[PDB]
């Protein structure tokens, strides 16, 4: 009981593999923008102060949230790489640290372009 430390938090492993295991196919189809830009919307939807209460409210439940997620993506017009990983985020109660998983996507995307020469 004397001093206190506060380390930052970003990129870890199972959360980073969620974006790299879904965008790994996007890297071959050139969807890093289709998956990195749509995933950011999930972080803003939970970061929003009016929407943050709806995602953390105890009434959304889990089975009901699965239908609300698919019924929201239908109006959000997500991309071909954002209507599957979205369920995993709301499948096992993963809407608390969901923005940290999107940040790892930007760091993993840098490793998909560094080893891919495509300029003339």
């Amino acid at each position: 009981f004397a001093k206190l430390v506060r380390p930052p938090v970003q990129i870890y492993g199972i959360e980073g593999r969620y974006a790299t295991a879904l965008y790994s196919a996007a890297s071959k189809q050139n969807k890093l923008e289709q998956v990195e830009k749509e995933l950011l919307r999930v972080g803003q939807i939970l970061k929003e102060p009016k929407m943050a209460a709806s995602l953390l409210n105890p009434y959304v439940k889990r089975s009901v949230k699965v239908k609300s997620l698919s019924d929201m993506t239908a109006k959000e017009k997500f991309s071909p790489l954002t209507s599957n990983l979205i369920n995993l985020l709301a499948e096992n109660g993963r809407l608390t640290n969901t923005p940290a998983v999107i940040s790892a996507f930007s760091t993993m995307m840098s490793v998909h372009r560094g080893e891919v020469p495509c300029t003339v």
């Binding site: 199972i14 593999r17 295991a21 879904l22 790994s24 196919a25 995993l88």
Partner: peptide, 25 residues
């Protein structure tokens, strides 16, 4: 507690494409 995951997003990619194997069991 609420835990128990095994790279589910990785196995899901194989179901949609599954085009990368190198003798691994």
């Amino acid at each position: 507690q609420k835990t128990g995951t095994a790279e589910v997003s990785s196995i899901l990619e194989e179901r949609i494409l599954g085009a990368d194997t190198s003798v691994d069991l």
